[PDB]
Each structure stands twice: as structure tokens, then as C-alpha cells.
Design a protein around this ligand. Structure first.
Ligand SMILES: Cc1cc2nc3c(=O)[nH]c(=O)nc-3n(C[C@H](O)[C@H](O)[C@H](O)COP(=O)(O)O)c2cc1C
Ligand SMILES: COc1cccc(C(=O)Nc2nnc(S(=O)(=O)Nc3cccc(C)c3)s2)c1
Ligand code: SF4
Length: 363
């Protein structure tokens, strides 16, 4: 209840604690997780990726081979609407974010869908999102947050946004190479000390100085209050954490509650991805199937990312990311694809979102 962490302003919104729960697809950070996180006073973030899978394709107009047909159904507006409404049944009008990656067919469509669903903040990575305000202009109060890997990207994004829209980002998330999901670094760079989050954050904060000290949120490998305090002492205004929340009871992908307490460090690895960035996965499910010669058949149905070119890169790397993550959300241990931060092996007990926030904020 008593904390020395101070509330964080992002645009017109305020969160009690300077903590983001990072967005996680597919079906990992939806209404239960984000709702309870926001209820606790942190920023709950709803992933807008693969919402067609929500409640086993409850809100898709067409299904092929048990998959949402095309990007209009993979990124389902009605599903997103219901997820946000259900989250607000828990967290009321407490701020909620919507996370949507840049490298998609229909980026503006999904951003505006998130705004119309009630998002207070849009968070976008997996690319250089130089045009978020173009699609946000009808929603003046929604804060816009790019995820970056470098101070150079901060400078570029601010200059482009300022020149074109007379607006700059409301915050920046700098994500390091210990994070879950995809990495904003080449595989070889993920292991180099120059790109450790403790080295990225000071550079991004110094670059931020020139544009009015836009708040900086450090993400990737942050485990406990000590890591939070380190990042804050390096100039960050807040932190974004995901793996800790991946190990909470309120996680919307229930499989993780059984997978994480058994997870060993040697079973976490960086793999190739149809998205075109290294992805940090657990060596289980579809990965194992690929190595046995029983890889699921690949034929693009959901058209989930532009860099893949409708199955070309999926066939090259050996798996479809939409199919695998959807199967994971639907409970497929044999063929699901499972992601984790580097810290995933440190999850022993599955605890409540409430006790996690208490651990992170007490004192
Ligand atoms: C399971 C999992 C799924 C993720 N999916 C996404 C995603 O869809 N979009 C995104 O921007 N980041 C994604 N990430 C990255 C997180 O939002 C977060 O920035 C990162 O994991 C923070 O590091 P930590 O996990 O050590 O706290 C994912 C991370 C994990 C662990
Ligand atoms: C449908 O495709 C899917 C399925 C699951 C997850 C995703 C996804 O978008 N995964 C992510 N993982 N980390 C992300 S990050 O934006 O925080 N870092 C980052 C990473 C790379 C580059 C830059 C600039 C920043 S995005 C997409
Ligand atoms: S084949 Fe490629 S573009 Fe199509 S759903 Fe799979 S990963 Fe996405």
C-alpha cells in the first residue's frame, strides 16, 4: 500500500505506479491480465494481435483450417471491443493500453480499432512507426508510444513526427535483448554488452533531452524492484515488464501457468521468425515438432504479417507464427508456439497479479 514509487504521467493519463505490463500475443495479455493489472494501478496493456482467436474464433466472419481467415479476422475489431469491455469490467476507467506491431497489413485499421475500443495508449514496436498520429487524429487524447532499440530511432521518430504532424511521442519504450517475443537486434548483437539495457537507457534518455524529456520506459530483463530502481536511477521514468506477468494466474493464455514452473534455462533460445526479427522461445511444441520432422503444414490463412509475404518466410523458417501462437492460446501443447523473456526460467510459483504488484511496489 505504501510505496516510494511515484505516479507516472503519459500524455493526459496518469498511472499510480511507473510500471507497464508489456503486451503479449497471441491471447496472452487480454482482458483478465490487463484488467487486473490496471486495477492494481499499473498500466494494463491489451495485445491487439491475433484477436480473432479470442474465445476460439468467436468473432471471425470466416474460418479456414481452424484459423481466422485473412488480416481482417486475425485482427478482429469485435473481439478487440469485447476484450476491452471485459477488462473495464475489472479496471473501470483506469488507463489501459493497446499493443499492436508495426509490420502488419492494415496497421492504421488496427490502431483506429484500438482507439474505438477504448484504448487510452497505443504501443507499437516491431518496426519504425513514423506515422501513428496519421491514424490517431480522430482520438486526441490517446497517447502514442513507440518501442525502440536505440537513441537513433528516438531522434528519427521525433523529427518525422514533429515535421509531419506537429506532434511528438508521449513516451518511448526502449527494449533490450533479454525481452520476450521478438528482439530489435540482430542475433549476434543480442549477446553483446554494448546493447545491454543498462547501456541503452542512458543513451535514449540523453537523446530524449533534446525534445523536452519525453518519458522513457525501460523494458527487457527487469525482474524485481531492484532492477526497477536501477533503471529509474539510469534516467528511465518507468519500466515495462512482461515475463513476471506471464507467470501470474490472471494470464489469459492458461498454458503458461503449467509450463513456466518447469521451465529450465537451457530450454530458452533465440529462433528465426517470419516477422523478420529474432524471437525468444521455449524449446517445446512446434519447435520440437519441426526438429522431429513432424512440422505442421504451412499455408497462409490469417496473413498475419507483411514481411512474411503470405507464407514465403514462414516456409523458409519452418513455422507460421499466427498458427502456432493461436494453437498455444487454444491450449495445444503439442503444436503451440511459446515465447518467454530470458528470465522465464526464474518463474517458480504462479502468483496473483495483486501479489506481484505488491512485491514490485512495496517500499
Ligand atoms: C510471452 C511474451 C509475448 C510477447 N509478445 C509481445 C508482443 O506481442 N508485442 C510486443 O511489443 N512485445 C511482446 N513481448 C515483449 C514484452 O511486451 C516485454 O517488452 C518484454 O518481455 C519485457 O521483458 P521481460 O519479459 O524480461 O519483463 C512479449 C513478451 C513475452 C514474454
Ligand atoms: C503477428 O505477429 C506477431 C506475433 C507475436 C508477437 C509479435 C510481436 O510484435 N512481438 C514483439 N516482441 N517484441 C516486440 S517490441 O516491439 O517490444 N521490441 C522490438 C522488436 C523488434 C523491433 C523493434 C523496433 C522493437 S514486438 C508479432
Ligand atoms: S504464413 Fe506468414 S503471414 Fe501467413 S499467417 Fe503464417 S506467419 Fe503470418
Amino acid at each position: 500500500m505504501v510505496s516510494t514509487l511515484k505516479p507516472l504521467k503519459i500524455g493526459k493519463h496518469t498511472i499510480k505506479f511507473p510500471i507497464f505490463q508489456g503486451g503479449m500475443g497471441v491471447g496472452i495479455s487480454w482482458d483478465e491480465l490487463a484488467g487486473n493489472v490496471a486495477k492494481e494501478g499499473a498500466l494494463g496493456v491489451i495485445s491487439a494481435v491475433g484477436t480473432g482467436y479470442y474465445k476460439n474464433m468467436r468473432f471471425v466472419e470466416r474460418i479456414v483450417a481452424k484459423k481466422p481467415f485473412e488480416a481482417l479476422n486475425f485482427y478482429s475489431k469485435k473481439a478487440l471491443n469485447e476484450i476491452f469491455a471485459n477488462a473495464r469490467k475489472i479496471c473501470g476507467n483506469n488507463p489501459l493500453g493497446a499493443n499492436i506491431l508495426y509490420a502488419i497489413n492494415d496497421y492504421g485499421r488496427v490502431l483506429r480499432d484500438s482507439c474505438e475500443a477504448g484504448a487510452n495508449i497505443i504501443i507499437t514496436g516491431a518496426g519504425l512507426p513514423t506515422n501513428m498520429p496519421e491514424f490517431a487524429k480522430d482520438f486526441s487524447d490517446v497517447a502514442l508510444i513507440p518501442i525502440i532499440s536505440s537513441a537513433k530511432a528516438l531522434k528519427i521518430l521525433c523529427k518525422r513526427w514533429s515535421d509531419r504532424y506537429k506532434r511528438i511521442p508521449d513516451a518511448f519504450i526502449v527494449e533490450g535483448p533479454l525481452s520476450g517475443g521478438h528482439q530489435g537486434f540482430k542475433y549476434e548483437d543480442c549477446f553483446k554488452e554494448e546493447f545491454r539495457l543498462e547501456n541503452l537507457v542512458p543513451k535514449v534518455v540523453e537523446a530524449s533531452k533534446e525534445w523536452g524529456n519525453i518519458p522513457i520506459i525501460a523494458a527487457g530483463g527487469i525482474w524485481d524492484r531492484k532492477d526497477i530502481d536501477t533503471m529509474l536511477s539510469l534516467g528511465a521514468s518507468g519500466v515495462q515488464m512482461a515475463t513476471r506477468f506471464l507467470g501470474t494466474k490472471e494470464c489469459d493464455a492458461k498454458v503458461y501457468a503449467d509450463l513456466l514452473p518447469t521451465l529450465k534455462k537451457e530450454d530458452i533460445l533465440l529462433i528465426k521468425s517470419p516477422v523478420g526479427y529474432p524471437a525468444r522461445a521455449i524449446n517445446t511444441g512446434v519447435i520440437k515438432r519441426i526438429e522431429e520432422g513432424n512440422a505442421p503444414k504451412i499455408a497462409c490463412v490469417s496473413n498475419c504479417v507483411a514481411p512474411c509475404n503470405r507464407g514465403e518466410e514462414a516456409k523458409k523458417v519452418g513455422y507460421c507464427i499466427a498458427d502456432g501462437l493461436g494453437r498455444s492460446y487454444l491450449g495445444n501443447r503439442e503444436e503451440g508456439l511459446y515465447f518467454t523473456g530470458a528470465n522465464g526460467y526464474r518463474v517458480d510459483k504462479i502468483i496473483s497479479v495483486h501479489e506481484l504488484i505488491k512485491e514490485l511496489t512495496e517500499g
